[PDB]
Design a protein around this nucleic acid. Structure first.
Ligand code: NA
Ligand code: NA
Ligand code: NA
Ligand code: NA
Length: 327
DNA sequence: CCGACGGCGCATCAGC
DNA sequence: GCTGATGCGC
DNA sequence: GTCGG
């Protein structure tokens, strides 16, 4: 549905969502507004009243009232007021820096640090992640065109295989579902030598090779199972350099790898449905495994999984290509 | 009425 | 110094 | 803020 249908309403709900999360620190209200904005973003009719909208799941009395105010006046008094509040607008804004959440943003504003310029002047008050988020503030907010994701995947798959041809790596996320653009790169990695009941260097080896070839440029965090950093495609030698991108790499036990690939491929709506279906079939599916449920609710030991298809077979469901997992 | 609304790895803090 | 909580991101 | 047991 064209963003012109109810774009005004969804923009308003999204803006409210952010202030709830970043300023009032009410994550649940944040999610409530986002859910309301989503259900509304998919409604194929230009809303004529709050009552019409209220019929939609996720939209209640309060948002119904706000929609009536918006339609009649073209704005929301509360939103207008908070938008112009120097302290709140600054807190909300500062959370756009990766690493700065509601707490840090609040602390910074409390002491006069309100703009990116102010952060740049106060380096010693920023932890490592935050300095990285600041350095690439602009790049991190840019999307990644699928053509660049493919080039990124090329490098990742090649280097991983170069380290050990036995590794198995899968780039997931919307990219795996075929999206024309992505917000980042999520890589799932595994190695036959690593199972649930079985080296603290499998991930390190891969991250190191990616750094040696200068693909990975910075590290936000890195442990034995999860790496979060920054990467960048090589510049054409004479063409404007590519922007830096966010990349995560997760090492998962082989016996849990496919449940993981299934999960991190989504979409979110699809996973919810699949887990719902699985339940009504006597199975419980989380990001790690799929286990049988006894007649009394007691979950049994995890079932053998050797491919995404195995998961679908257990719950009597035809395998659905990532492309068809929009929901 | 009133609790659920995602759970967990990693960096860093808070307390001992 | 060790251990648990907290902030943050996903 | 919305849902629902
Ligand atoms: Na509703
Ligand atoms: Na942030
Ligand atoms: Na943010
Ligand atoms: Na080999």
């Amino acid at each position: 549905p064209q963003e012109t249908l109810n774009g005004g309403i969804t923009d308003m709900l999204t803006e409210l969502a952010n202030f709830e999360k970043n300023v009032s620190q009410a994550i649940h209200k944040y999610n409530a507004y986002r859910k309301a904005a989503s259900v509304i973003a998919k409604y194929p009719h230009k809303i004529k009243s709050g009552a019409e909208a209220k019929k939609l799941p996720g939209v209640g009395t309060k948002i119904a009232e706000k929609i009536d105010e918006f339609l009649a006046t073209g704005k929301l008094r509360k939103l207008e007021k908070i938008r112009q509040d120097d302290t709140s607008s600054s807190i909300n804004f500062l959370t756009r820096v990766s690493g700065i959440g509601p707490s840090a943003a609040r602390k910074f504003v409390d002491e006069g640090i309100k703009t990116l310029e102010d952060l740049r002047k106060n380096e010693d008050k920023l932890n490592h992640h935050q300095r990285i988020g600041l350095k690439y503030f602009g790049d991190f907010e840019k999307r990644i065109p699928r053509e660049e994701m493919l080039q990124m995947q090329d490098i990742v798959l090649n280097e991983v295989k170069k380290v050990d041809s036995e590794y198995i790596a899968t780039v997931c996320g919307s990219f795996r579902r075929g999206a024309e653009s992505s917000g980042d790169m999520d890589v799932l990695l595994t190695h036959p030598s690593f199972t649930s009941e079985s080296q603290p260097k499998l991930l390190h080896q891969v991250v190191e090779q990616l750094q040696k070839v200068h693909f990975i440029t910075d590290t936000l965090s890195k442990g034995e199972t999860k790496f979060m950093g920054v990467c960048q495609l090589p510049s054409k030698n004479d063409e404007k350099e590519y922007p830096h991108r966010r990349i995560d790499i997760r090492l998962i036990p082989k016996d849990q790898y496919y449940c993981g690939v299934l999960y991190f491929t989504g979409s979110d709506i699809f996973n919810k449905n699949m887990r719902a279906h699985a339940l009504e079939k006597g199975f419980t599916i989380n990001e790690y495994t799929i286990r049988p449920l006894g007649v009394t609710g007691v979950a049994g030991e995890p079932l053998p999984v050797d491919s995404e298809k195995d998961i679908f077979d257990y719950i009597q469901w035809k395998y659905r290509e990532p492309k068809d997992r929009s929901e």
